[PDB]
Amino acid sequence: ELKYIATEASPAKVAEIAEDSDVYVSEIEEAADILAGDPEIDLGIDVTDELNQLE
Amino acid sequence: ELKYIATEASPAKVAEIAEDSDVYVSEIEEAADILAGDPEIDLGIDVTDELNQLE
């Protein structure tokens, strides 16, 4: 049985499946930040001073 | 009967099956330490000093 555990807790496979998860994690989180990319448009198209009179 | 015990308590086989177990044991235990490999990422990506103000 130690052989059968060591077949499938193989450190050759533990390290594979751990590395794969990390790449997908940074792929998804950065794909959330470009999903919030529009602040760069909002801060750009509106620069309106005039309301300092309104202030 | 001593012959039949000595056929299957053969020291040629006792020493084989004892050596095989030890290799699988170190294979599995080290495959547990690479299963805890992520502390190296946690200690790396977060180094945030600023909270010393918050402290």
Residue numbers in the entry:
A (entry chain U), B (entry chain U): 110 to 164
Excerpt from the paper describing this PDB structure:
The ESCRT machinery mediates membrane remodeling in numerous processes in cells including cell division and nuclear membrane reformation. The identification of ESCRT homologs in Asgard archaea, currently considered the closest prokaryotic relative of eukaryotes, implies a role for ESCRTs in the membrane remodeling processes that occurred during eukaryogenesis. Here we show that Asgard ESCRT-III proteins of the Lokiarcheota self-assemble into helical filaments, a hallmark of the ESCRT system. Notably, the Asgard ESCRT-III subfamily is substantially reduced compared to eukaryotes with only two ESCRT-III proteins (named here CHMP1-3 and CHMP4-7) encoded in some species including Loki and Heimdall archaeota.
Next, we determined the cryo-EM structure of helical CHMP4-7 tubes in the presence of CHMP1–3 and DNA at a resolution of 3.6 Å. We were able to determine the structure of 36 nm PspA-like rods at a global resolution of 3.6 Å and a local resolution ranging from 3.0 Å at the inner rod wall to 6.0 Å at the outer tube wall. The rods are arranged by helical symmetry with 1.05 Å rise and 173.9° rotation. Thus we, relied on the strong density to build a model for Loki CHMP4-7 α1–5 into the density, while no density was found for helices α0 and α6. CHMP1-3 is, therefore, not a regular member of the symmetric rod assemblies while it may be part of the curved filaments, involved in nucleation or occasionally bound to the rod assemblies. The structured elements of CHMP4-7 adopt the canonical ESCRT-III fold: α1–3 form an extended hairpin, connected to α4 via a short linker (E117-P120 Fig. 5B, inset). Helix α4 is separated in two parts by a short loop at G146 and connected to α5 by an extended linker (I154-E159). The monomers are arranged in a j + 4 repeat, where α5 of chain j packs perpendicularly against the tip of the hairpin of j + 4, forming the typical ESCRT-III assembly motif known from IST1/CHMP1B. In the assembly, helices α1-4 make up the wall of the rods, while α5 together with the tip of the α1 + 2 hairpin forms the spikes on the outside of the wall. In CHMP4-7 rods of Asgard, α5 only interacts with a single hairpin at the bottom end, which is a common feature in eukaryotic ESCRT-III assemblies, while in bacteria top and bottom ends of α5 are interacting with two hairpins connecting two layers of the assembly (bottom). Therefore, the Loki CHMP4-7 assembly more closely resembles the bacterial configuration with the characteristic spike, while the Loki CHMP4-7 monomer adopts a conformation closer to previously determined eukaryotic structures including the α1/2-α5 interaction motif.
